[PDB]
Ligand binder design. Sequence first.
Ligand SMILES: CC(C)S[C@@H]1O[C@H](CO)[C@H](O)[C@H](O)[C@H]1O
Ligand SMILES: [Mg+2]
Ligand SMILES: [Mg+2]
Ligand code: NA
Ligand code: NA
Ligand code: NA
Ligand code: NA
Ligand code: NA
Lengths: 210, 1015
Amino acid sequence: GHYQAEAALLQCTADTLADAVLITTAHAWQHQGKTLFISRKTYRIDGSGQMAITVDVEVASDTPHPARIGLNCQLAQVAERVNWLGLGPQENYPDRLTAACFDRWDLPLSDMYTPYVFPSENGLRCGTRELNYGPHQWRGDFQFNISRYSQQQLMETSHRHLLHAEEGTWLNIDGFHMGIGGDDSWSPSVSAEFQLSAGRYHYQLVWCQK
Amino acid sequence: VVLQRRDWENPGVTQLNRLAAHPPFASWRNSEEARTDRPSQQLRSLNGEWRFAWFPAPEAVPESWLECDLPEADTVVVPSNWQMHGYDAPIYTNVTYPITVNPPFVPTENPTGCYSLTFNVDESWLQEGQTRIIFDGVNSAFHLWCNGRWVGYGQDSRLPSEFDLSAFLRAGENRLAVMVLRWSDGSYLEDQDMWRMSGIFRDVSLLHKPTTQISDFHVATRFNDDFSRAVLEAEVQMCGELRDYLRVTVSLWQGETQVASGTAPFGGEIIDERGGYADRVTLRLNVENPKLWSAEIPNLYRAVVELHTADGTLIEAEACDVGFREVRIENGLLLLNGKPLLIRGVNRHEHHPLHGQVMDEQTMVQDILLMKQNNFNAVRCSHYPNHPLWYTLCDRYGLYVVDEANIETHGMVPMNRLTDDPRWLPAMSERVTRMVQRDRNHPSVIIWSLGNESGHGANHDALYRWIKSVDPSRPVQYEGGGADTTATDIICPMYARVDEDQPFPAVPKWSIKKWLSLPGETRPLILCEYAHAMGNSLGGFAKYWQAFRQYPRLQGGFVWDWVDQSLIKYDENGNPWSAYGGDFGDTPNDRQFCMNGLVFADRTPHPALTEAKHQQQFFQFRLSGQTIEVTSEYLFRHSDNELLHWMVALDGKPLASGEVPLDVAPQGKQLIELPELPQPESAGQLWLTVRVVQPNATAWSEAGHISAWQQWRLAENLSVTLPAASHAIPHLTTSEMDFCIELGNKRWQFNRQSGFLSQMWIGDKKQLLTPLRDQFTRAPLDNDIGVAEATRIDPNAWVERWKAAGHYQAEAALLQCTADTLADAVLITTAHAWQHQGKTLFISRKTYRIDGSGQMAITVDVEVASDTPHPARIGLNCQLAQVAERVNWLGLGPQENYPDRLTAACFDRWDLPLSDMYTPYVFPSENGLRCGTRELNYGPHQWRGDFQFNISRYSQQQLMETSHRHLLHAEEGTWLNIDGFHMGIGGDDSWSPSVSAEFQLSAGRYHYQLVWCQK
Ligand SMILES: CC(C)S[C@@H]1O[C@H](CO)[C@H](O)[C@H](O)[C@H]1O
Ligand SMILES: [Mg+2]
Ligand SMILES: [Mg+2]
Ligand code: NA
Ligand code: NA
Ligand code: NA
Ligand code: NA
Ligand code: NA
């Protein structure tokens, strides 16, 4: 039920600190009475206008290891360039990132999408410490992809020529992403060390305007 | 003559007047006594009280000593090492010879043990036949006199030296004088890594043989292809007068049942142009469906060899245990009885903390039972032939033995300097040939070894071929000169790693997986030494066993080693303590390197022994749905003394359990389907534990013995229910110097200058003696330390890297300390930098959240500079004010376990006395860690999270600063170390870094969270 699991809110609080506002949230994803994941977050917005997002995820040990532990949203902005400090410039995944180099990369948005004839998850860049898109900046240690196509649309389209640019830009920022495998393509081929099996995951992001 | 000839400085003289070597003799004059292996009237022990005087050199020994007792002599027990009686110092050196390397010469100051015995001989022994004396082991060389008359001389410390005393003895009282030299030319071939001791350290005996006698016998067993048929072949040689009426009968018995018998007169088949052996005969006995010998089922027959006359008068009988087994290498695999072995082996030195190198039956039995109880099936005699009883015990209890010649020349430069030299071939040959002649009839002996750490020389090639020629029944191995030379049937490296190459010049240690498939290589690979168990070690032991099971030609190895070579010393209070190298004034020495055991010298297990047991299990398990698949790794036996216990528990709370009989054929499978388990009440992780239990007692185990176990995570129910909101609210009291939190009778004190929680109160009582601070270091384990390189200690060693980077000196700089009041909690936020000479090593960022329920949630985020050596641990430490009797935890246990040594540990609720949370390694270090811990309880405290911890009355600082465990003193309160992350311990070897990459703390950023609360 990973594709059908609905978020259930367990907690949502706001606190005022000496120099910041703190939002604390907790969610559970369930399918047929079974809790798959729990997500606990704090958002800390300070006087510099930077939102520090802290995320702790619990994954039920008996659920199939998830494909990613991350956040997504559709941004209103469509900018021409994507600029990042991390592994690049080409698409790279946790078990396919040896060729990528850590540096400052700057590409047109279209280059952040790989036009696989059969549409799928694509365009990820790993080991990224800073992402810049339009007025936004994200900082941390994450994996991301950025395109005009939702995961939902990539999931529902059989050929690439049938894809349509959606309004704005879909951003996927992952603390963790599962390997892609490929030893063969007719059985599970992602090696144990590239499966998301730790049970407890932690990542932190900073969202700001620069 | 004796002082003039200096036979102890001449490698061409290894003995004088010594009798030929042979299998164990008892010279029974009764066949039934021979059959039942009862005592023989013709084999007397001379062990007991002897007279002894120590001298600094053989020149200092008075001539009068030959004729009568020296008044200044003491009465001492023999067998003994004279170092153990305090006459001089035992010396611990590993590689470097304890004497100047100047072969064949030894120091002029050469400790000399003067032994003597006044003993009686029956007149009947002298009126007929031959009376010989047998010295099972004398270290290192000796001259022998009897009644003032010189008899002979002997070398090789580890094989019996026999002399004919018939012409020397008188009826009634006689006196032996034995002059034992500590050093001889023999010493150059005896450079094993062990205490250097000396004396008559094995049994002394008198054997009476008739004049017409069995002088040798060899027993071989050959089989057809399916082992349903065997021929036992016995070659028997006589000495004395040949007469036509002489006969030899060889009978074979299975218990009380005679299986076969054959009689012939003397006279062997034509051998060459000159005829055959008139003084030999070979008997061949047919055996249908023989019960085969193995370590799994040590089936033994008894062979009795009778020398007799035609009319039926017995002259004498000799005898041995026969094991019907075939050892062969075929298609690159070592086979026993047609089946590929998997050697679960250990190296074992003959060591006793009190008696030094003297062995006794009780100790030997204790060792074997402990070995078998821990899933060992094999032992290597490192690095010499053993006390003769060892092989009898291995025959009967079932262990595969590698018999090893007493030749080690480790300290030569280069290592093969003597073994490549034809002048040393004679001395070397005797150590090999006389071992084979003694031990060739033991079924437990399955492999011959040419010695240890003596490079590869042409003398090895000669002696390798000599063995293949005289005994085709057993493979020959030898590790020297690169582990895969022409002198070995088996690739037998020491401390070759699983996946990592160590490409040393000339003698590389390839990864074992890679070694097998090197171009042209076909041989089986069995490590003669691996998993160096020095102190807190056996990290990565699981990695060897995964490879052993996966690769057919990786057929296992021998752990280094069985037992810590510590010795007992006594202080002023007369209290015994465990001593290592240097502790006797011995210098140069190699300190604690004599202690590499899976057990302490008194045979108490180290925690690593349980990891060995688990990894060497003879049953493999898989879980699919509700089905458990049990695979037998036994080659010969069915599981006819086994049942499976299973148990399902929710975070330690038993929910369901049961037992199933195991009926698995060798190498076979059994499917066991678990019944539908009741639905669990609450949130938590269900855990399945299986154990294989032996209901019946055996020769080597007691009823209820657990031989195998495995665990799996079953279903997990994540807690979604919010905790009931506590009405109480904590108050923040701000000072210039302190942030203080109060909740009823509870106070938390945060020092605003240091940035740490400096104190906690429950009413009047202080909780802490030292503040709660980050810790990134550990008291170094032996594996962290390594060895001295030369001009300095090896800079590659972990401890050296940590010291150089300033890890042990790093001082916390406070970057931020702030307090905040929340809706229902107080939040303390801190940041620290650890710096050394301007360099920031670690940054720790923390939040402490204290809520109305009285719980403190600590969140720790650590940055580790990528260019600092990877830290030993990421955690917290403090000294608790309280000392409590019990320690209770939900996590991996019950024994000490580390990230690369935790497979043996089980997840459950464990409760131990506090003293059991400390491992008393003779050389103190970080110890007693337990991993995968979700909850820890100690007195009034409870910690929850996902952490590793140790808890003891010793600080890391004290452990780090103390050379010996007996010098440790319990500090006030209790030191607690709670780690989010702990580096592996390694141990593939203990003289270079050996922690695998996946167990190094190299991620750069680390997160962990704890909840501290009262219980
Ligand atoms: C220290 C190494 C260079 S030699 C190393 O020493 C060990 C110490 O227990 C063992 O004696 C090994 O057999 C030997 O190879
Ligand atoms: Mg000599
Ligand atoms: Mg050595
Ligand atoms: Na698709
Ligand atoms: Na194997
Ligand atoms: Na050693
Ligand atoms: Na059974
Ligand atoms: Na120490």
